[PDB]
Design a protein around this ligand. Structure first.
Ligand SMILES: [Zn+2]
Lengths: 191, 596
């Protein structure tokens, strides 16, 4: 039943935050020992659990969420802490938490000319509800009646992140995986 | 959607776009400065153009949004900055004509050459020749040729352009609703806040006058002392009572009295301390010098330098092919990137320079949290002043003794202290009268108080009255002496320099009080005091969010400019000066002319 967690842990491409990928890994066993040992993660925090007991704990229907955010945005991914990207791009239920892993990956994701591939949504009507994905690209306007191109007060809702090699650490790209653990929804897929 | 809701969303996106393009332009500029090549110029130009174009469109969009409607001060300040749009109002061909005038004057100043009367073949460009001659020469004849030559070639050519220069500037100002170009210039100091932090352009002029009257005695005593010292080198030329001749001051425009120091040293035998060879004995290196400067900041409690800065910054002159700009500069590229570009040689002066540059970088770090529009020093003067005080404390002997470059045995004596103070006075006290009069004349010309036919006449009369400086040879209306100075030619205000000097001394006095130093102000060192650093930090953090009056109040307890700390710093020197000048006459007579 043990299956490597390495391949989603490491991939050629991780998606943008607005289109956060959700991965269902169930019936895949991870020792969790390497989690504690490796310092590959600049920040490792499990709000939901102490994690001392993670290895013994049986896991049911675990979820992996993978996205790229800049370093400043990493703290926003926490209980509460709504800010902007938690509010509009990825929402974490306050009650339910698992373990959050964040590592700098400046050399792979940034270059001198810059990488503009990653995207974030800065304008939205309403607030994201927990674990909900909005993929739509509406023209946008606080008055409704969206005007597609140059009219006053109408703007596109998506902005490129623009990572660069020369930038400071907060600006530098961070790849973050959030694993979410559903407790006892079904008999534990992982034991 | 309410008025400010529309305003905030607009400001919201303006900021995002601006950050990216500003960074690209900054990177191009850095590349050109580090390596000088023609396509680096080309790339630099392209990036700059796009940034400027983007700004103009945003400014136009901003202006069609009522400002009074906004009820939040933070938002209003940001909209206000975008809305200024000063030159947009003027007509396009009026626009074009003005641009041509400006380009022409800059070129004339740069390429101007003055040829020796005695040798027709010898012709000297100002940048690598004329200044050197004025700096080193002790011959009256030689100094005179240089002064007159620059005066005659550049000034006469510049004057027709200058007059057209003035008229159009005034026109755009009135289109923008300012009374004249002068208050267009005076606008930056002006601030509006509800509970008595209000400042107005009218008030600034009055404040300058009051400060000037107070520092007047100290200047006259210095003038008398300089009078006697130069009498020894030029006995026939200067009649005591009379004002000093313009050419002999040591600078072409007479801005600084620094080079007069070898002639004027109070005590020849005692030497000013220099730790350069000590650094050589201890094998100090450029990286070493920078590391020590960082340590000084850490002990006062301000944050240590970033990981990245050390790697990307050019701390040494590049070897071989790369061509570099010599001047030391501090760069805030943006996006968390801070760099210092300088060529460092092991010298005492460089140790001091490193501290000053570091100070500028620290403030840049402090205001980063503030919004893109508000990411700046509160006023023109504040940024320079913050860098300056750090250098002063580094320069004190106790700090050097702690470093170990200065031996423990060394004891400072009264004679050295007087020598140090006079050197400082020549640079600081001497500059203020010149700065005041220059701005004085320009403002009057812009409003039209002075008629064009009397422009030169008034300028020279003012020099005699305020700075005690008399022209060596009489000058016709065709000559344009103010235009010869670089700032006037390139349209730069000089009001900033006067204000900065007052601010720096106030900051130092307050910080020393927190540190509880007992003794003379010149002796005080702020090193190893956490508390002094902390309060400085609070002022640095606010940036431009709140007014300049409020910021000054936070550190020193006073809303307005106060000249008293400056006087306290120079008080020991003043008593000594008074005793020397007790016998000789104090003051000057405007009537005396070298030409007579
Ligand atoms: Zn500076």
């Amino acid at each position: 039943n043990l299956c490597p967690f390495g391949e989603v842990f490491n991939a050629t491409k991780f998606p943008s935050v607005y289109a956060w990928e959700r991965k269902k890994i169930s019936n895949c066993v991870a020792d969790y020992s390497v989690l504690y040992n490796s310092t590959f993660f600049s920040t490792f925090k499990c709000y939901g659990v102490s994690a001392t007991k993670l290895n013994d704990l049986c896991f049911s229907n675990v979820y992996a969420d993978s996205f790229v955010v800049k370093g400043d945005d990493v703290r926003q991914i926490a209980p509460g802490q709504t800010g902007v990207i938690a509010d509009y791009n990825y929402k974490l239920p306050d009650d339910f938490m698992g373990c959050v892993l964040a590592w700098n990956t400046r050399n792979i994701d940034a270059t001198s000319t810059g990488n503009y591939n990653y995207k974030y949504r800065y304008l939205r009507h309403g607030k994201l509800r927990p674990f909900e994905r909005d993929i739509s690209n509406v023209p946008f306007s606080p008055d409704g009646k969206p005007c597609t191109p140059p009219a006053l007060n109408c703007y596109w809702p998506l902005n490129d992140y623009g990572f660069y090699t020369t930038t400071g650490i907060g600006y530098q790209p961070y790849r973050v995986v959030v694993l979410s653990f559903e407790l006892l929804n079904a008999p534990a897929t992982v034991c | 959607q309410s008025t400010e809701d529309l305003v905030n969303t607009f400001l919201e996106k303006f900021n995002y776009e601006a950050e990216e393009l500003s960074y690209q332009s900054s990177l191009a500029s850095w590349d050109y400065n580090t390596n000088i090549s023609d396509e680096n110029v080309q790339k630099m130009n392209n990036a700059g153009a796009k940034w400027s174009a983007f700004y103009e469109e945003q400014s136009k969009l901003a202006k069609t949004y009522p400002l009074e409607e906004i009820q939040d001060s933070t938002v209003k300040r940001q909209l206000r900055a975008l809305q200024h749009s000063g030159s947009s109002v003027l007509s396009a061909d009026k626009n074009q004509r003005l641009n041509t005038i400006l380009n022409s004057m800059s070129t004339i100043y740069s390429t101007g050459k003055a040829c020796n009367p005695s040798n027709p073949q010898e012709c000297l460009l100002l940048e690598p020749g004329l200044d050197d001659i004025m700096e080193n020469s002790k011959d009256y004849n030689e100094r005179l040729w240089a002064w007159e030559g620059w005066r005659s070639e550049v000034g006469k050519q510049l004057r027709p352009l200058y007059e057209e220069y003035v008229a159009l500037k005034n026109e755009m100002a009135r289109a923008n609703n300012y009374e004249d170009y002068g208050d267009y210039w005076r606008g930056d100091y002006e601030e509006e806040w509800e509970n008595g932090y209000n400042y107005s352009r009218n008030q600034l002029i009055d404040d300058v006058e009051h400060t000037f009257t107070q520092i007047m005695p100290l200047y006259q005593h210095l003038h008398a002392y300089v009078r006697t010292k130069l009498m020894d080198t030029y006995p026939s030329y200067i009649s005591p009572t009379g004002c000093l001749p313009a050419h002999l001051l040591g600078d072409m425009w007479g801005r600084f009295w620094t080079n007069l120091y070898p002639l004027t040293v109070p005590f020849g035998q005692k030497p000013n301390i220099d730790v350069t060879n000590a650094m050589v004995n201890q094998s100090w290196d450029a990286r070493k010098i920078f590391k020590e400067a960082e340590k000084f900041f850490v002990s006062v409690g301000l944050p240590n330098m970033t990981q990245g800065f050390w790697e990307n910054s050019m701390l040494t002159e590049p070897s071989d092919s790369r061509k570099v700009v010599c001047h030391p500069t501090a760069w805030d590229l943006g996006k968390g990137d801070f760099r210092i570009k300088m060529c460092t040689k092991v010298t005492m002066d460089d140790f001091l320079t490193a501290h000053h540059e570091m100070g500028h970088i620290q403030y840049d770090m402090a205001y980063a949290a503030q919004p893109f529009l508000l990411r700046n020093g509160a006023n023109e003067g504040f940024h320079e002043a913050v860098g300056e005080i750090m250098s002063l404390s580094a320069a004190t002997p106790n700090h050097l003794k702690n470093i170990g470059l200065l031996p423990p045995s060394f004891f400072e004596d009264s004679e050295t202290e007087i020598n140090f103070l006079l050197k400082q006075a020549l640079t600081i006290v001497g500059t203020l009268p010149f700065t005041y009069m220059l701005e004085k004349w320009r403002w009057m010309v812009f409003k039209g108080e002075i008629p064009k036919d009397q422009w030169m006449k008034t300028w020279w009369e003012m020099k005699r009255n305020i700075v005690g400086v008399v022209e060596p040879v009489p000058h016709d209306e065709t000559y344009c002496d103010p235009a010869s100075l670089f700032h006037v030619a390139n349209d730069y205000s000089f009001i900033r320099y006067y204000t900065r000097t007052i601010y720096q001394f106030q900051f130092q006095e307050a910080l020393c009080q927190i540190a509880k130093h007992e003794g003379p102000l010149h002796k005080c060192d702020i090193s190893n005091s956490s508390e002094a650093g902390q309060k400085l930090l609070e002022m640095l953090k606010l940036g431009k969010s709140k007014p300049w009056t409020y910021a000054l109040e936070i550190v020193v307890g006073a809303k307005n400019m106060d000249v008293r700390p400056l006087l306290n710093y120079f008080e020991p020197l003043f008593t000594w000066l008074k005793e020397q000048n007790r016998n000789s006459f104090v003051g000057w007579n405007t009537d005396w002319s070298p030409y007579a």
